[PDB]
């Protein structure tokens, strides 16, 4: 256990070829309390016209992050460090197609 | 980036009383620095292996090898933390080795191996061997790291691995596009043993123009465990156009293992 | 139960429970994306994690279907602000702080404004 000083030192989801929707991951004990977990809008990517190009895949970017949970759950400044998986955004890739 | 067996993992070597298991990649030696730190690992080397579980599944495992240096810092060696870092996701996994019996000779050089970290096909990892105690603030490195790269399911001994197979590495749709009379197309293909949907993707072209005269897409819903490995056929009405004959049929699976990013399979029919 | 909470600070037990044990096979797509990117390993010996992987957009624009760059589309970095622990020294004395580190997790392709 470590004593730490209290002072903890854009619109791409709509704009992107592979767009996403943010989901409310709310937690009253955890800090950050609310984390926005981005989930892909389509299976494919949005083409030059504004329709879905199914010859393309929209996959999400995922990350491990450090959050702090109140430990014990009630106490004021006593926290225990937590590691979690977060879907951050979606990118658009080219799918691996095998020919005959 | 999962450990293999929560078995009684052993690092116990002749002349070395050793024990291993789980660690947060934050050591007491980082929070509380000890004055006399031991020297860095010599000749670290990660190499790809495979593992067989009691259940009969085959898995890619990162095979961590290292040794120690001749110098007198040996007596002050208390253990070793082994990190594996998934570059794409920053997903860390650590195991510390607790040396109960302190090493004091160098008559025989000590060689070390860990081969329980399971690694996923087509990936990149920074595998570090941190000697413990960790060096004092503004101390010299004392660890070693090596970039380890796992191959894709095209790799020979990879496509017979459980993670590969589960993402349909050994699947063959034997896809066949037989032309029907009333300007139609029957599309025949074999199915995989997963209750996931698929998508047939038709792109008809003229005889050499490489731009779609007709593009169609069709959804084949999740098969029941009965329909597993049994060949399916879907009849689609083509665009009744002259020149628009050279077809391209692309079957896309949606296996849990990949979700969308799965291997697609292409068929190309002439005139 | 509650520990004796000292003033102007926090108690930070470091026993990090990974409540997110994935079980969703990820891959090396950095090379395949329309907005491709490279990864760089960052080592700060006085931080936790000591190793942080930052991503860097390969180009100003997005790569098309033929394999060449398209400038009418822009390659943007997508960032995730995370926490790190910072060890500091005055001498023999060691202090601990929490820092917010903005990490570039990869690149997406966006239509301009
Ligand atoms: C981003 O990466 C460029 C290409 O190299 C990558 O290397 C990776 C190695 O793990 C992997 O193979 C990946 O697929 C590759 O794309 C670098 O570009 C290279 O720069 C050299 C000079 O510095 C040139 O000699 C090379 O020809 C050039 N490669 C190409 C494809 O032209 C970039 O330097 C690098 N940039 C950043 C910001 O990290
Ligand atoms: C799917 O079939 C392959 C080959 O027969 C096998 O390796 C795999 O375990 C099967 N899985 C199920 C659930 O039937």
Author numbering:
A (entry chain A): 44 to 52, 64 to 154
B (entry chain B): 33 to 303
C (entry chain F): 46 to 158
Copy text from the publication.
IL-17A and IL-17F are highly pro-inflammatory, “signature cytokines” of effector T helper 17 (Th17) cells, a distinct lineage of CD4+ T helper cells of the adaptive immune system that appears to play an important role in clearing pathogens not adequately handled by the Th1 or Th2 immune response. Here we present X-ray and site-directed mutagenesis data on human IL-17A/F that provide first detailed insights into the molecular architecture and receptor recognition properties of this heterodimeric IL-17 cytokine.
The two copies of the IL-17RA complex that make up the asymmetric unit are essentially identical, and overall, highly similar to the published complexes with IL-17A29 and IL-17F28. The binding interface is similar in size (2373 Å2 of total buried surface compared to 2,219 Å2 and 2,294 Å2 for the IL-17A and IL-17F complexes, respectively) and comprises the same three main interaction sites as in the IL-17A and IL-17F complexes, originally referred to as Site 1–328. While IL-17RA induces significant conformational changes on the “F-face” of IL-17A/F, the “A-face” shows virtually no structural alterations except for small shifts within the skirt region (flexible coil, F-chain N-terminus, and β3-β4 loop of the A-chain).
